[PDB]
Design a protein around this ligand. Structure first.
Ligand SMILES: [Zn+2]
Ligand SMILES: [Zn+2]
Lengths: 133, 57, 107, 95, 218, 215, 97
């Protein structure tokens, strides 16, 4: 037979208690394996309720102190000449090298952000990379 | 359902379970309890829950 | 299903009997001879051929039906059985495969 | 642990764009500006979606236009011909 | 009784078919499974599986992803060792060819074309009186083209059939038994899921073969 | 054959059509049950009465809900709910009491297998919604093993036949909790004026305590 | 062993930043006779029109450089509890390699 009503609860609960009642002749195949390896969350139907008021979400955005300097570099010297390669993992880029230089200079010398930015610019110019935006 | 926030206050057995009976001497009792007294929370909850028991007894 | 072979062998026997009664050797024999013999031995004023008397071979009489699509127990044979239109979809899959293969190469 | 995110503002935030007159001042006497902010032929005032400025400045300039019209600095029907060869701010399509 | 013993033996053991070696967070990140749709495409029941957001884009928690993927592979492999029927669904036409091809290669079956009304419910009238409906369903794309929940999850929850779907930020993991948060849309992710399922089901099949041979010997 | 059926109601529904006009279409409500805690309700529509009965019975035996029960003759605890303006309040009741409930509920409990309880229905009387809310509540009720393993305490039962003796019902399968529950005083719980009346005893009505037929 | 947090912090996208006004190299995986779909990065591919110049120089595995607006086209209308999507990404190309 089997119970076709799924809003009640989980398939496992229904199959188990129906076997206990004695309706089905014997359990299905997936029963024992589900009992042995249950998931982290029991499958149960629940209706989606839209939000109201100040219940926006438990989720927040992702930002970083180095993301600040990424923003400032994209603002001042934006549209880097090199084309980003997303296929290559750990792909080095102009902005990535620049943020690395910024971080190392600022946490080695411990100076003001603007002057260490200007001297990072001087350092990359000495290295010979193009600085056209 | 009943409308009060704690309808057990208005129930009858709550008034009867009160464990206090004043002597025949005392004729009047006066209470003074502030609304926002953080120390007066006891007084406010008393005035809210228990005085019915006293008056019924 | 065995009714098919039953009808086939019985039709062969009836064909031999027909050749015998009409009076020619059963070695060589044709379906135009079958239909001429049937028209002569059992005429009919019916206009539609489907209604007229016809002694036809059972393979052509019975329309072919798909045999059991799954084994005696468990899985089915074709790999689209749990949906309908299995043959159509498998053919379309092969067609699209040939299309993309020719693409990568390039009534 | 250190690589984890952190609560922080978005420095990618584009600064709030300001209209051409958001900061500047407007009066009932700058007939040049107040004629730039009106139709040349019919004298009808161009709305917000035609002009492209904030509501406070739109209200200020339209009240100033009405004041200049009733005062005498500006006409009501025909835009002044001398202010036609000026920058066209209010977008249109008929030409 | 020894047949039941053989059926029950793999259950007590954890990671008994060695499904863990197939996947690693390195491979998932390389296949870009960690991506997600915008916050506008976000879903409540998917929220807790979102590790975070960046540029109004959703990001998936890879530890939970790996946990659910391990559980899904283990379940599929147990079912294949039990010879349980497996049926794939991917309504997305972008990968129907590849999915049907890998289905042929596995021997487990699939349905990527349009889903018909009550195909599972009235399957008896459709096909015949006696027919063995599948024992496991899986979803490479849980939603249809118009982005509604595919009728198959509902039909399976009704008729007691287990389902294992890769749930994206738009999907509804409530009905799914073993929802795997990931990237339904990316081709690297699709190919990786297909290869993992190939390896898993084929290992389960050959392991049943070898165990049956050992018992025929004994 | 273990299942027994029951026809809760039948109605002659009519809907009109262009050429033939009014058409009689029998709608029927049915229930099925073992007597072992398993049952299912269903509707059936058809032009013929017997055909509707058959449709309803078949899809009923296919659609079934299971509900637990405490000692094979009662629910675990009283259940008060509302469903489509149909307030219903069932009260657990010990042995030797019987079933004093709406006749539909009586038949449904005959099918389920519980021998005694009490119930009241208020507001609208639509027995379809009545049955739906009934099964919803009987499915959403929590068992005592469930509640014990959830909370982390030992359940303790007390009778009137038995004296002051603690009868443990069910214990947590998992690790028991260390600290006990703090005494919850004057709880914020919405109670019912009618049951408070009947408990205080001032309530009077000829229609309450009638000596009806058997069960 | 490296945490997913570390791999994300060192990821190409976190250093990429906003997808708008940024060049990127990509290749195509499927191409119809009139248009071509570049798989450049991230989740979605970007559909594009074949230019009038150098029409035939577009085959599988070609590395074309192009900018992009966003990696996903979406929009929320008045009755859309969830914003409509395009399953694609807008992009403009001005060179190859
Ligand atoms: Zn302004
Ligand atoms: Zn998606």
């Amino acid at each position: 037979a089997g119970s076709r009503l799924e809003t009640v609860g989980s398939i496992f609960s229904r199959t188990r208690d129906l076997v206990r009642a004695g309706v089905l002749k014997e359990k299905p195949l997936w029963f024992d394996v589900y009992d042995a390896f249950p998931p982290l969350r029991e499958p149960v139907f629940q209706r989606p309720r839209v939000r109201y008021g100040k219940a926006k979400a438990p989720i927040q955005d992702i930002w970083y102190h180095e993301d600040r300097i990424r923003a400032k570099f994209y603002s001042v010297y934006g549209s880097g000449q090199r084309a980003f390669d997303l296929f290559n993992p750990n792909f080095k880029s102009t902005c990535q090298r620049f943020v690395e230089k910024y971080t190392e200079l600022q946490k080695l010398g411990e100076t003001d952000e603007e002057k260490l930015f200007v001297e990072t610019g001087k350092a990359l110019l000495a290295e010979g990379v193009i600085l056209r935006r | 359902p009943m409308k009060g926030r704690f309808p057990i206050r208005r129930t009858l057995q709550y008034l009867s379970q009160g464990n206090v009976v004043f002597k025949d001497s005392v004729k009047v009792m006066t209470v003074n309890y502030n609304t926002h007294g953080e120390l007066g929370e006891g007084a406010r909850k008393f005035v809210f829950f228990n005085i019915p028991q006293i008056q019924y007894k | 299903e065995d009714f098919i072979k039953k009808q086939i062998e019985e039709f062969n026997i009836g064909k031999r009997h027909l050749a015998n009664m009409m009076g020619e050797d059963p070695e060589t024999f044709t379906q135009e001879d079958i239909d001429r013999a049937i028209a002569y031995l059992f005429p009919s004023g019916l206009f539609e051929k489907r209604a007229r008397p016809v002694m036809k071979h059972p393979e052509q009489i019975f329309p072919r039906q798909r045999a059991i699509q799954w084994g005696e127990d468990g899985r089915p044979f074709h790999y689209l059985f749990y949906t309908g239109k299995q043959s159509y979809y498998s053919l379309m899959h092969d067609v699209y495969g040939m299309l993309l293969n020719l693409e990568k190469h390039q009534r | 642990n250190e690589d984890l995110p952190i609560s922080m503002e978005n420095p990618y935030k584009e600064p709030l764009k300001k209209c051409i007159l958001c900061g500047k001042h407007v009066d009932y006497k700058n007939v040049q500006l107040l004629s730039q902010f009106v139709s040349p032929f019919t004298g009808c005032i161009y709305g917000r979606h035609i002009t492209g400025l904030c509501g406070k400045k739109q209200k200020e300039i339209t009240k100033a236009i009405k004041r200049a019209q009733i005062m005498g600095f500006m006409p009501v029907t025909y835009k002044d011909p001398a202010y036609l060869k000026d920058p066209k701010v209010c977008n249109i399509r008929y030409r | 009784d020894f047949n039941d013993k053989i059926l029950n033996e793999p259950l007590k053991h954890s990671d008994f078919f060695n499904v863990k070696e197939l996947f690693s967070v390195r491979s998932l990140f390389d296949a870009r499974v960690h991506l997600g749709h915008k916050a506008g495409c976000r879903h409540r029941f998917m929220e807790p599986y979102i590790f975070g957001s960046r540029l109004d884009h959703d990001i998936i928690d890879l530890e939970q992803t790996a946990t659910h993927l391990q559980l899904a592979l283990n379940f599929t492999a147990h079912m294949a060792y039990r010879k349980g029927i497996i049926l794939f669904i991917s309504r997305n036409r972008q990968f129907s060819y590849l999915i049907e091809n890998m289905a042929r290669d596995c021997g487990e079956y699939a349905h990527t074309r349009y889903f018909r009304g009550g195909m599972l419910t009235n399957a008896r009238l459709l096909f015949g009186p006696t027919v063995r409906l599948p024992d496991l369903i899986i979803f490479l794309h849980t939603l249809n083209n118009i982005f509604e929940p595919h009728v198959a999850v509902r039909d399976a929850a009704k008729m007691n059939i287990p389902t294992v779907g890769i749930v994206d930020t738009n999907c509804n993991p409530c009905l799914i038994t073993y929802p795997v948060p990931g990237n339904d849309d990316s081709p690297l992710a699709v190919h990786l899921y297909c290869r993992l399922f190939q390896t898993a089901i084929t290992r389960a099949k050959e392991k049943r073969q070898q165990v049956e041979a050992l018992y025929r010997l004994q | 054959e273990d299942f027994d059926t029951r026809i809760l109601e039948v109605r002659n529904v009519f809907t009109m059509t262009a050429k033939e006009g009014r058409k009689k279409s029998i709608r029927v409500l049915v229930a099925v049950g073992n007597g072992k805690g398993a049952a299912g309700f269903s509707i059936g529509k058809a032009t013929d009465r017997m055909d509707a009965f058959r449709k309803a019975k078949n899809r009923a035996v296919h659609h079934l809900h299971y509900i637990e029960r405490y000692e094979d003759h009662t629910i675990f605890h009283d259940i008060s709910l509302r469903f489509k303006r149909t307030h219903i309040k069932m009260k657990k009741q010990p042995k030797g009491y019987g079933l004093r409930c709406h006749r539909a509920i009586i038949t449904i409990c005959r099918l389920i297998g519980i021998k005694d309880m009490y119930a009241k229905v208020s507001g609208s009387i639509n027995m379809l919604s009545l049955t739906q809310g009934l099964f919803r509540g009987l499915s959403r009720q929590e068992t005592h093993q469930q509640l014990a393993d959830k909370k982390g305490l030992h359940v303790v039962e007390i009778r009137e036949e038995c004296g002051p003796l603690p009868i443990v019902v069910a214990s947590p399968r998992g690790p028991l909790r260390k600290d006990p529950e703090p005494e919850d005083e004057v709880p914020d719980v919405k109670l019912d004026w009618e049951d408070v009346k009947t408990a205080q005893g001032m309530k009077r009505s000829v229609w309450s305590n009638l000596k009806r037929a058997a069960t | 062993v490296e945490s997913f947090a570390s791999m994300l912090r060192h990821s190409p996208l976190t250093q990429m930043g906003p997808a708008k006004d940024k060049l990127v190299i990509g290749r195509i995986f499927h191409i119809v006779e009139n248009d071509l779909y570049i798989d450049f990065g991230g989740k979605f591919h970007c559909v594009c029109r074949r230019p009038e110049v150098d029409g035939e120089k577009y085959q599988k595995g070609t590395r074309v450089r192009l900018r992009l607006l966003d990696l996903e086209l979406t929009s929320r209308f008045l009755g859309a509890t969830t914003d409509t999507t395009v399953l694609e990404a807008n992009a403009v190309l001005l060179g190859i390699q």
